[PDB]
Design a protein around this ligand. Sequence first.
Ligand SMILES: CC[C@H]1OC(=O)[C@H](C)[C@@H](O[C@H]2C[C@@](C)(OC)[C@@H](O)[C@H](C)O2)[C@H](C)[C@@H](O[C@@H]2O[C@H](C)C[C@H](N(C)C)[C@H]2O)[C@](C)(O)C[C@@H](C)C(=O)[C@H](C)[C@@H](O)[C@]1(C)O
Ligand SMILES: Nc1nc2c(ncn2[C@@H]2O[C@H](COP(=O)(O)OP(=O)(O)O)[C@@H](O)[C@H]2O)c(=O)[nH]1
Length: 300
Amino acid sequence: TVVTTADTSQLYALAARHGLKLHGPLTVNELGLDYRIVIATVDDGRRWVLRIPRRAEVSAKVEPEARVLAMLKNRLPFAVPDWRVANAELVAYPMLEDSTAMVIQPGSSTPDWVVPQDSEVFAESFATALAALHAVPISAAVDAGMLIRTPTQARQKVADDVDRVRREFVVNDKRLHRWQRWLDDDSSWPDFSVVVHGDLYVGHVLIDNTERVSGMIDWSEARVDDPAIDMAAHLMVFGEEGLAKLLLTYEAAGGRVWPRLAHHIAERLAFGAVTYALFALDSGNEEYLAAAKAQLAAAE
Ligand SMILES: CC[C@H]1OC(=O)[C@H](C)[C@@H](O[C@H]2C[C@@](C)(OC)[C@@H](O)[C@H](C)O2)[C@H](C)[C@@H](O[C@@H]2O[C@H](C)C[C@H](N(C)C)[C@H]2O)[C@](C)(O)C[C@@H](C)C(=O)[C@H](C)[C@@H](O)[C@]1(C)O
Ligand SMILES: Nc1nc2c(ncn2[C@@H]2O[C@H](COP(=O)(O)OP(=O)(O)O)[C@@H](O)[C@H]2O)c(=O)[nH]1
């Protein structure tokens, strides 16, 4: 025979226990630390995504995310995963066939492609899609059992993350002072929270072949929190010019802004170093830790 990375027999058995009959081509991404991701063909002729929790601690997150997606489905003018299977040993949904807004080969550090800076259709539709998401009523999030952070709680969470990094790592003095000045800068912080995606960047946005936003995936970090969380990666990828365009259209679409929002987003992006370091720490992966320590010690 031929050795293949996927164990088709075990995958078939797992899927069949949950009412899904695999038949035909599949592909497997084993690089995730929490889930194995398989895109498999099913007997409905469709591709489905199998998100397979690796451990009990990951399994525990399935039911709450399922409640999130259940709530969001009718409340967003774009598609989200339809978890027709959602349990501790398997999440499965029909694949949303539209491409992600960035394409990258598994394992690679460099994308093959990212939706272009000058794509006006992408820019405008991402901005309106984001305004739509952030318009989801807080009451709907509460009814769905979501994690809720008031503005005070949102700021406390950032402080807590910073302090956890300070306990576990040695951080460049100026970097640390940057975060502390931000945490102390009342004018930077919003006086409201919204439903956020929590892990939003081009890799988690789906686009149709005109480059119009058509969906968003991987909602595991969704919660009610600081709106700027969902804008940091847009600044990283599309720069200050892209951010300026985003904010004008977001506001025009009914998105709530505040005067120092652009500044706050830049500080949130800087804070990404904390997020990465805590991910590294929690992963126990020596390569991620090496990268994190290096970044933290470095002057920005
Ligand atoms: C452009 C293309 C690149 O995308 C990014 O720059 C975006 C903009 C990051 O988000 C930025 C921006 C932001 C806000 O996240 C959206 C911030 O939190 C993170 C740390 O960095 C992403 C996604 C980060 O991932 C996130 O890292 C988190 C620690 C966990 C999070 N997730 C699994 C829970 C995960 O998605 C992270 C580290 O770069 C992924 C690793 C693998 C990369 O090095 C890959 C190769 C990236 O360079 C990239 C795909 O090529
Ligand atoms: N086009 C498309 N890609 C998907 C879909 N579901 C998963 N993917 C891809 O699979 C990758 C990993 O899935 P993801 O849910 O992000 O796993 P996680 O990062 O561990 O949470 C994503 O980054 C996408 O590239 C989908 O419905 N449509």
